[PDB]
Amino acid sequence: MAHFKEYQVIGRRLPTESVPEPKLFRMRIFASNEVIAKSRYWYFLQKLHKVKKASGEIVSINQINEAHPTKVKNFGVWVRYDSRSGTHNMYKEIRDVSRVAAVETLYQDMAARHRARFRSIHILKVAEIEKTADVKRQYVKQFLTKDLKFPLPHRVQKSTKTFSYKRPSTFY
Amino acid sequence: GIDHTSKQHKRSGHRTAPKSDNVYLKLLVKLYTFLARRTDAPFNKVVLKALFLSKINRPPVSVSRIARALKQEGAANKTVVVVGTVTDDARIFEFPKTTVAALRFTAGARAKIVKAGGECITLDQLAVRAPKGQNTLILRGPRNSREAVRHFGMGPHKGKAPRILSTGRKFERARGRRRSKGFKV
Amino acid sequence: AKSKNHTAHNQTRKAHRNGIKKPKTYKYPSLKGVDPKFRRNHKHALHGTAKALAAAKK
Amino acid sequence: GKSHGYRSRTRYMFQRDFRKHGAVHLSTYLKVYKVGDIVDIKANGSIQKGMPHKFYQGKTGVVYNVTKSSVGVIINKMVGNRYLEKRLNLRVEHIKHSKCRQEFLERVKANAAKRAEAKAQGVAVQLKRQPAQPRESRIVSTEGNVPQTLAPVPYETFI
Amino acid sequence: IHEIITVGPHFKQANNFLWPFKLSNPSGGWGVPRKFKHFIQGGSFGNREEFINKLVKSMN
Amino acid sequence: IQAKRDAKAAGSYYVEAQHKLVFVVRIKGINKIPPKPRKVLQLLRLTRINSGTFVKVTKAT
RNA sequence: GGAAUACUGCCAGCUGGGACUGAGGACUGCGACGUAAGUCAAGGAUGCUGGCAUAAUGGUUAUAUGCCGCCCGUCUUGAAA
RNA sequence: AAAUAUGUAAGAAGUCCUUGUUACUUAAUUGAACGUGGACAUUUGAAUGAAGAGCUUUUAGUGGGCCAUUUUUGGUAAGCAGAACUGGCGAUGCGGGAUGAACCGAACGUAGAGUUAAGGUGCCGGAAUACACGCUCAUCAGACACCACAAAAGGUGUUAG
RNA sequence: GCCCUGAAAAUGGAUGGCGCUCAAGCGUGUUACCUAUACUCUACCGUCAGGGUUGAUAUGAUGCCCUGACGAGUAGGCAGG
RNA sequence: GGUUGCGGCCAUAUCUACCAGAAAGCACCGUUUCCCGUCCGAUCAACUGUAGUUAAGCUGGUAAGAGCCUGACCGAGUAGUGUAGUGGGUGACCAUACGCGAAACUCAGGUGCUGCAAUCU
C-alpha cells in the first residue's frame, strides 16, 4: 500500500482425492510487500470463487518488473471505488514510465479528489493505450503535441541559510 | 510491568525453626540440621522438620501405641522414634522390651518401658547410635483426637459439634435439632 | 432513595481469585443414594469375599 | 411479580422435534446402563416423569446408580467459586450413552492392538495423537492447467 | 539452536528450557505510525512472516 | 533453491513446505487485556512487553 | 546473445568517531595462541602522566534562573471546589 | 438456522486373560457389583504452560458504587433511569488528549546509558518552515478519535467522474 | 470531492495561543527526528526463593557466603523497628 | 426373490390417480349350537376351511404427479457474526484486517432399508 511493487499471484483450491489437481488461478496484484499481496489475492478470490484460504493454498508469488521501464507511456486505468454514499466505476488515464509508477499516482489521485483511501478502491484493469489518439482524457492528450515545450515560470530556489544579503529573483 | 501469574513475595508457609526458645531444643535442632544437611538419610530431614512442630502437631504418642506398632512384622527390634513426648497407658499389660527415643517421657512412661528391661534414650543419643537413622520406626500421635477439632465444620448437616458452654436438654436440643420442632439441623 | 438493584459485575473476578478448583475425586466414592437392596447384598458379597481370602492363608 | 417456576424459560427446550412427536421409540427402552457409564442428558417433554431440571439439559455425567426405570447420574455443578457434586434421578427416556466415550474405548482397543503388532516385531509404536501439521512441499504441474487469471468486477445494480 | 530451527523431537523440552527472550525496543523504530493495527494495514501485530527477522534483529 | 528452478524449468511450480516454526514477540503492554488472550499470552510465556519466544506450528498452536 | 546494476538477504569479513559503566578483590573455571619457554582481549580496570593547599572538591544554606507544584482533614461514584 | 459463548472425554482409579465372593438378579455359575492370580511402562495414550500441588483454622474491611466499547429495556430525549460480558475508575501515580477520575500509551524500590509507545517536530516547545501528488480562496475558510454538535434543501464556484 | 448558502443570544475570547493561504488547511504516500515512572544492559536498597557452610580450627549460626526473580496501593491484615 | 408372524430405524415408508399380480401365504368370504359382545353376529366372540373371489385389502409398476429424502465450486463465501484500529461519516450507517459462516433459492439424483423365525414354483 505505498511504494508499489506489482505481483503475479497464482493459487488454487486444496486438492481432494475426488479432485486431485484443481484449477489454478492468477491475479496481478499491486502491493508494497508480498504479505499484503498474498492477502489481497484471497480478498478478491473470496469474492469471485467460493473459497477461503483455510480451504486453499497459494502456489506462486512472483514480481512483475516493467518490461520497458524507461519508455514513457499513456495508461488506461479502470477503477471501482466506494464514495460515502454509493460505489462507482471510473476510467482515467495516467502518463508515466511504469505500471508501478502509474498505480501510485492513481492511488494518490483517488484520495486527492474523491477522498478514497486505499481500502475502498478496486483496480479493475490497467493498460498501455497503444495508439495515441486512443487517449481520450485531455489532461494527457495535452502532452502529446508535436515539439511540446513549456517554461516553468516563477522559480523559487530554496534557501540554505535563514538570512540573505540580497533580494531573491524568481527568473528560471 | 509484568502480567504476574503468581503472587509476588509469598513466603513458604512453613516453619523454619522452632518458635520455641528452649536452648536445649535449639541445640537439638542445631544437631539434626547438621545431620540432615551432611547426609542423605531421609530420616534426619524428617526429624529436623518435626522438631519445628507446634504442640498441637506434636500430639503425644502412647506406650500402648508403641507396643502395638511393635507387633508389626519384622519390627519387634526396631527403635521407635517419637519426636514428641511419650505417655503412659495403664491399659496394656504385657509390654515388650525395646529402646525408645523421644523428647520427653512422662513418669509412668519411662517406668513401664524400663521395668520391661527396656531403654529410654534421647534424640541426640539416638543421633549417635543411628547417624543415618537406621532400624528406626517413626510414630506420630492422633492429631484429630483433639477437642478443638470437634467443632470444625459446624454447619447444617455437617454433623459436627456445637460450641456450647454447658450441655443438657435446654441447651440447643430443640428448634433445628428435630423434625418436631421446626426442622432438623 | 432508589439504589442499584442487581449486577453480576466483578463476581467472576471474585470467584477466580482462589477459585473454581475441580471437584475432589476418589476411587471408592460415596455410596449415597444407591439401591438399598444391593447395598445389603453387597455387604454380604464382601464379608464372603473377605473370609475366603483369609481361608487362603490358613 | 417475577416468576421463577421450575420449568420456566423452557418453552423451546422441552418441545419435541418437528414431525417427531408421539410415542418414544422402543430403542430407548432397550439400551442398558451400567455404573460408570457416561450419559448425555436431554429431556423429553412427553415423558413428564423422571425429568431433569432445565439446568442439566445439555450436560453429560456419570451413572452412580441403576434402578427399575431410571439411572442416577452424578453431575458436577459450579455454584459460586467451586464445583459441587450433584445427584440426578433421571428416567431413561431423558438419557443417552455418550458417543465420545465410545470413540475412546474403541481407540483404547486400537492402541492395545497396535502395541501388540510392534512387540511382535520389537519395533517402535508412536501411539499419542498428533495434531494437524503444516504441510510439506509440493510441485503442482501446469499440464492441462494453465492458470486462468482473474480480475476484479465492475459495479452494477441488478434491482 | 539446531533443535529449534529444525523443530524435531525434543523441541518442546529444548524450547521450554529457553527462558523467554528479553528483547529491547526496536533500535531504528517500528517503521510505522501506529503499531496496534495489523501488518497488512500499516504496521505491527499479526504475522509479518519473513519480516520478523528485520524486526527482531533491531530489538536484539 | 534448485527445486524451484527445476519445477519452473518443467513448466510447474514448486510450492514450498509450510513453515513449522515461528518466533513471537509481544508488543502490547499488560493493561486492559481480555481474559482469553491474556491466558494464551501467559501460556507462551509472553508476559511482559517485547519479550519473545519460539513456537512450533501446529493447528493446536 | 553476453553482461552490469537495483532490490532483498547472509558472513563465526575487515575497520574509524562518540557516549555511559569499571560492580568484584589471593588462587581454583571454560578457553585462546604458541614447536616450545611462555603469552592472552579467556569467571567484572589497569597502566602512564599531570593538577590541588588560607586550595581542587564535597555538604548545608540564601537568592536567582529553566521547567514543574491548586488546601489540608473528611464524607463521597466524584473535592482545589 | 449460525457466530460468540457452553457440557463431557483424551487411560495405572487403565486395558486384557484366569476364576473367587453374595441373602441381590437370572430359565440358568446366568448377570450384577466387589475381589484373588497372570500379562502389558520408549510416545502410557493430543497441545501449551506449571512461577509447586494439596489442605486446615481463623479473623479485618466491605455489603451507596461509577465509567468505556459491545449487546440491550423504558423514555422525544438526557451529563436520564435500568440489565448482559469484559475491561477500567473507585484504591493509581507516570507519558499523551492544552485543560480534565473513566480515552490513548503504559502501571510505579533508588539511579546511570540506550531505545521506544501513544502523541508530536513554523514559533510558544524538545524534534525536517522535510520530501511527494492532488485538493481548497471562504466581505462567517479550515485545521484530528473519546470531544465539546449541526440537518433537509440548494449553488453556471471549482475539481474528477 | 473541497468551497459557498441554508447557519439567530445574551461580560470580551479562543484549532490550547500566536499566526498560517503551491499552508503551519483537507486527502494520501515516503523517510528522518523528538520524548514516560514502559522495554534492553549495569550499580545499590529491600522482599521472596534455591543452595553452600562452625569438620579440630577468636570477633554475630536468629550468622557468613553463592544464585535467580520480583517491587503500584485506599479500606484492611500481619511484620520489623 | 414371493409371503406371513414378531420387529428396528419411523415418509426414499406418506398422499393422489391408473394399471399389474404366477405360487404359497394373507385376505375377503360361509356358518351361529357352544364360551361371549352387540340397537344391529356390522365390530367383538365362537364354528367350518367346507360354498365362493382376487373385486377389495395387501404387493409391486406408471406419473415433465403433491409431499418427503440426498447432493451440489446452485445461490453465496452472500446474510449474520468473534476479534482490531486515534478507520470513513454530521449522523443514520459503512468500508477494511485476522477469522467463523448460513437460510431461502436453483438445479440434479432418489422414492424404503433391514433383523429373527416360518413357508412357497
Ligand SMILES: [Mg+2]
Ligand atoms: Mg536582484
Ligand SMILES: [Mg+2]
Ligand atoms: Mg495391618
Ligand SMILES: [Mg+2]
Ligand atoms: Mg484423630
Ligand SMILES: [Mg+2]
Ligand atoms: Mg475424646
Ligand SMILES: [Mg+2]
Ligand atoms: Mg431507600
Ligand SMILES: [Mg+2]
Ligand atoms: Mg440513582
Ligand SMILES: [Mg+2]
Ligand atoms: Mg446495594
Ligand SMILES: [Mg+2]
Ligand atoms: Mg427494590
Ligand SMILES: [Mg+2]
Ligand atoms: Mg416475568
Ligand SMILES: [Mg+2]
Ligand atoms: Mg427464548
Ligand SMILES: [Mg+2]
Ligand atoms: Mg402423531
Ligand SMILES: [Mg+2]
Ligand atoms: Mg405427578
Ligand SMILES: [Mg+2]
Ligand atoms: Mg536495541
Ligand SMILES: [Mg+2]
Ligand atoms: Mg540508522
Ligand SMILES: [Mg+2]
Ligand atoms: Mg535514533
Ligand SMILES: [Mg+2]
Ligand atoms: Mg512501510
